[PDB]
Design a binder for this molecule. Sequence first.
Ligand code: NHT
Ligand code: NHT
Lengths: 426, 418
Amino acid sequence: HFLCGVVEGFYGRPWVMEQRKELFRRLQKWELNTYLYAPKDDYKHRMFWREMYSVEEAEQLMTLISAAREYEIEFIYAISPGLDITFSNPKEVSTLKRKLDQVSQFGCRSFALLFDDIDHNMCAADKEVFSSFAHAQVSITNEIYQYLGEPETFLFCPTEYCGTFCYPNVSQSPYLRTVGEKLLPGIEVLWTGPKVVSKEIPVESIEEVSKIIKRAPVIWDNIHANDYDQKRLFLGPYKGRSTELIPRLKGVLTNPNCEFEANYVAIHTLATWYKYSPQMALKLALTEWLQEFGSVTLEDLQLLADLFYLPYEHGPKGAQMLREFQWLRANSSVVKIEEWRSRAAKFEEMCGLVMGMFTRLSNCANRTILYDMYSYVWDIKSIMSMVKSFVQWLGCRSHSSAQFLIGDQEPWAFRGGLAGEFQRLL
Amino acid sequence: HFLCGVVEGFYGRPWVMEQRKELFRRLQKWELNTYLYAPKDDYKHRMFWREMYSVEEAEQLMTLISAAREYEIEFIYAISPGLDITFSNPKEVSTLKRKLDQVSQFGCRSFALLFDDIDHNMCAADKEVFSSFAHAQVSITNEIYQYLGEPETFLFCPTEYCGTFCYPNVSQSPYLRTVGEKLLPGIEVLWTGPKVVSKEIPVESIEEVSKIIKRAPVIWDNIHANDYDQKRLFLGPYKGRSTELIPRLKGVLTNPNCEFEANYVAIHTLATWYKYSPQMALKLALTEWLQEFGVPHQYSSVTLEDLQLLADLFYLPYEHGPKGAQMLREFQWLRANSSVIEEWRSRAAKFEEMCGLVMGMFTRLSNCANRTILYDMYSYVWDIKSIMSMVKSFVQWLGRGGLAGEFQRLLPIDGAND
Ligand SMILES: CCNC1=N[C@@H]2[C@@H](O)[C@H](O)[C@@H](CO)O[C@@H]2S1
Ligand SMILES: CCNC1=N[C@@H]2[C@@H](O)[C@H](O)[C@@H](CO)O[C@@H]2S1
């Protein structure tokens, strides 16, 4: 079968169990089938990967694995040992089996070893036994694979997991060639595309990588991931991957926004795409999303998705406001002048729709959804309001010489903190 | 007695019940005495203030007020009806009493009516009855006060709640004079200082406002609030308020970061101030904070310097800590003098080793046992780490923000306070 669902694989606060049960429910309702457990900062998954689960942790984990079974969602337990594992020490290897055996006894049948986001060097001891980094990982991955009875689904995440991370390139990487040559045929290989966050995933790039890993890979997709930028959130549709990829791929697991409720559209459009027009998929997702709010209108949600769209694209309504603002600023010296004021008034009315969107979200019944998104919505509301004020100030300069900011300011007029001060020097 | 503690009075996701019980414990350990319940987006507190609590909610609220009693913390229930209340409609007024009675029967003896962050205009119906906005609030506040037997603590928050919000000024505000003249003497008045986020709260400004409201005010302090800017966090010490304020004030309730665990320093130093040097207070607070950054128990870490650095990168609304200002000055100097000789490269190396200390803080925080603490602060720390690593690479080279950011960089006031 083709694996399609969600990987919880992002940095930061992981989802809690009640949220994960809700995700299985949603995956089944939308006819997806797979969940990959890999939250980088759930401490026993990576930083303290050798440590057994406590009695209470084990009870939560089995209750969670049962919910996946109950909802016919395949539960894939990952582990990330690569920060400090000594690959050539056999108790290290046994500690890894012991760890996986424990989760086996919770009911888990599908597993993954992750070697992403780690140094490319080995310790001294390991360099004598293995001839390269690729040798050390597939050695232990094969040994683990077979040790657990050669299971239904086993995933392997390479260190060179996207186009740009391949040295020197994809076709000639001695790491990936070793992976394809020596990783056992029943083990799957994870791939994020040409980039960590791929704008597109062309099929020629998937033929290229497939040839050297001797397998169609499973896509770990970071199109909707937002752990790398506090200010960002991605409510746009799944986009940039042709449906012609489906037969050339072993699966697609989306790594979405850290805020659980913000991923309704991210997962809905992946579902629709698994059976394609991005705009039409978005309309279906936003329409269905609307009534989990009740007040908020569809037009409000259209605007909200367009302000928080995709990593390389704003939505149409967001791009327009930005163009109008750039045109207004550039042409502001003239304050024909009747066109400037006509488009300034229209621009201010669009800012009002961002204000009113925020107001109605703030009154909605689903407080869970509101809390996941509150900071993002207040962020864009307050910047739009200062932008509206700036346009009004530009229009008033034919009858005033006052500075835009007069006098002493509250701290929010100057945005970003110390991080912001560093960025502006770049 | 003089009230000193915390108001949970910020916008966005409010604290949950297990977090608030933990807050009472800390307030008691540090000899503070008061908690004011006022989360702006707890829907039954403001947006849907008329609605009664369900039985599941009533059981959580009753369990929570019991903890406040158990921990000798006075529990003050606030409610914010001012967005859409019709003051002259007695059905509105009965619903307000019916709401407070319900919470009274949960064990609550102290209450507050908040009229902050609302329009200054009234509906047509109410302009018939009341001669001004201030009259309508004082009328219903007085009515609520007496209806519940004139309780020990009752607080009233004006709409003109800070110097700059007073029209035209503090001493001549028609709104505040009606409040001082007509609000019953046993009701307390909330005030945030000259500004919403006051850098200082001078003594003369408290004299000025006290004269016109006829009573010493309770300071609602937003020095550590961080709901107004996604990117900001304030781990610095309580600062800018002389202890000479204490005899002139009815109390001090601090409105701190939304991130529960980030307010150790904010509340620890308020406690220290209540019994003063901001830097000595910070050292005591960070020292004690260090002992809840454990290492997980292993069966098969954060230093004090790490925490000093973290607080100095996320310090106070109007000043960065010393170590952050230092790195920021050095970086500007390196960029400015980059047109180039051994001085440059000598200070560039020292700058990237300071960058290394940011990374090393983040790495050790990541390994700490208290995952609650890490999660509350992760995106702030993730952010500064990855930007410093890009700054470090940029310094070597010489040898984002979303749609909001794109709009921000087009404004001329971008970086204007740098
Ligand atoms: C399958 C490749 N492994 C990867 N580990 C990181 C993830 O944990 C992040 O969530 C993602 C986006 O910020 O960037 C990479 S991708
Ligand atoms: C007692 C004055 N009322 C106020 N309501 C707002 C608070 O809810 C915010 O959290 C604070 C920081 O943004 O600024 C004002 S202060």
